[PDB]
Design a protein around this ligand. Structure first.
Ligand SMILES: Cc1cc2nc3c(=O)[nH]c(=O)nc-3n(C[C@H](O)[C@H](O)[C@H](O)COP(=O)(O)OP(=O)(O)OC[C@H]3O[C@@H](n4cnc5c(N)ncnc54)[C@H](O)[C@@H]3O)c2cc1C
Length: 447
């Protein structure tokens, strides 16, 4: 049984791991069009801030290690087309230009996504950079110490844009973040959280320009200005972090795709064609808070889907359990985490919700280490089932969001969480901990 896996990033990598422990006998080929196997773009911020010195260590697998396990690794080799009925792919060795056709019994593809670019005048003056992969990581890092870079503009105020803004602010640059949306990180956090984070970023000389549409880049050879409908900003470097496009144009006509380019798959990771499975950023995933399919481009999702594709390789026997969209990040001193439905998600899905927010010290009064914490619990108005939660503090309390992720999956209610058994010891929390306290508030709001 010969299985070909496309892609060495999170989705493709975990498919290879699950093949090794479920089908040790199989002939496994692993293809990567790039030069470097399994670079962790999630670790790029630690490298840009100087926490990690060696860019080549920001990875989780090497071709050498997988070959020791009997996998055939082909780096610098691109799968150019799939011929699904005859079960063949044509591959191109990018160093020699050779093209050959390869047959498979089963094919798992995790083609991923590419950074979205602004197709505007000035489009590629020098020093308009993107943020994905090893080559961009290295170029961004060289700019961090360049004395000619004084002003950097990042377009996009989502997760990746704020990571870039923090990294260049810490390198001593002046940073402006521009976006059409009215709040940074709105996809992850509601207004009472992003108001605090905006103040924190502005204290560290990041200007946030919201509600503005970028119209063109101006400069002579290299960028010098970014002009929006409302303003013109000086820029020595631009980081475009607007979003991501599925890497699927080459699949048009071969596999069924959604209007937005995402690959259609069912709950067993099967595509429209026999024996080809698709995983990761290029697909939709079962979203349990709202019982629907949503594109949630996270490494956690791609890894779980990669293993479930291998579980359903011979028979559709194991439907995907679904996810809650859990995410977490530190922005200067604040560490936040969120899961499930928040205001932007509810708007997009047309879902009605209720919520309580508690802001108080997470340790008892007499303990001098006490610090404020913000917690918001979102629940269904009819059933009072838990639909989401967001938490933030300068203290690290983020592991508590893992309990809310499970509560949503288990369809627990505000009353279940109000009296759930969480430990107490006064160096760590209060007799009713942060989750108990917000659920107790919600029980009062519904009485
Ligand atoms: C800056 C940054 C920070 C992030 N931080 C986090 C985080 O902290 N936590 C988290 O959960 N997620 C994070 N993510 C998201 C996460 O990295 C992605 O969700 C995940 O990498 C998706 O994996 P994938 O396999 O679907 O695709 P991709 O990572 O896009 O990889 C696809 C791979 O397949 C290769 N390929 C594509 N086409 C072909 C082909 N035709 N032939 C051969 N090879 C091909 C590509 O070269 C690429 O290596 C972050 C992403 C970025 C960019």
């Amino acid at each position: 049984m010969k299985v070909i896996v496309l892609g060495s990033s999170h989705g493709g990598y975990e498919a290879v791991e699950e093949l090794l422990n479920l089908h040790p006998d199989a002939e496994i080929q692993w293809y990567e069009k790039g030069d470097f196997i399994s670079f962790l773009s999630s670790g790029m911020q630690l490298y840009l801030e100087g926490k990690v010195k060696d860019v080549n260590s920001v990875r989780y697998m090497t071709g050498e290690k997988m070959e020791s396990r009997g996998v055939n690794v082909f780096s610098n080799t691109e799968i150019t087309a799939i011929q699904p009925k005859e079960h063949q792919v044509t591959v191109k060795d990018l160093v020699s230009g050779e093209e050959r056709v390869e047959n498979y019994d089963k094919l798992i593809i995790s083609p991923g996504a590419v950074p979205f670019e602004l197709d505007i005048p000035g489009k590629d003056l020098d020093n308009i950079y993107l943020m994905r992969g090893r080559q961009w990581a290295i170029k961004l890092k060289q700019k961090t110490v360049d004395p000619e870079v004084n002003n950097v503009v990042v377009i996009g105020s989502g997760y990746i844009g704020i990571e870039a803004a923090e990294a260049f602010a810490k390198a001593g640059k002046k940073v402006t973040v521009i976006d059409i949306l009215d709040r940074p990180l709105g996809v992850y956090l509601d207004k009472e959280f992003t108001d605090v984070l905006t103040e924190e970023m502005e204290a560290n000389n990041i200007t946030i320009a919201t509600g503005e549409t970028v119209e063109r880049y101006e400069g002579d050879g290299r960028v010098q200005k970014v002009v929006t409908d409302k303003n013109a900003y000086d820029a020595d470097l631009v980081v475009v972090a607007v979003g991501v496009r599925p890497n699927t144009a080459w699949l048009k006509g071969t596999l069924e795709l959604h209007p937005n380019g995402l690959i259609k798959t069912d709950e067993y990771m099967r595509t429209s064609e026999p024996d080809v499975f698709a995983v990761g950023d290029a697909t939709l995933i079962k979203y349990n808070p709202a019982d629907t399919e949503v594109n949630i481009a996270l490494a956690t999702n791609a890894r779980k889907q990669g293993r479930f594709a291998v579980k359903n390789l011979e028979e559709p026997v194991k439907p995907f359990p679904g996810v809650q969209g859990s995410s977490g990040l530190a922005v200067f001193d604040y560490k936040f985490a969120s899961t499930g439905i928040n205001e932007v998600m509810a708007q997009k899905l047309g879902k009605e919700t209720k919520a309580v927010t508690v802001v108080e010290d997470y340790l008892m009064d007499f303990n001098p280490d006490k610090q404020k914490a913000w917690f918001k619990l979102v629940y269904d108005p009819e059933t009072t089932q838990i639909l989401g939660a967001q938490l933030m503090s300068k203290a690290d309390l983020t592991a508590n969001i893992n309990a809310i992720s499970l509560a949503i999956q288990a369809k627990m209610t505000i009353e279940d969480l109000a009296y759930a058994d969480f430990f107490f010891q006064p160096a760590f929390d209060k007799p009713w901990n942060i989750i108990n306290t917000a659920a107790l508030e919600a029980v009062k709001q519904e009485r």
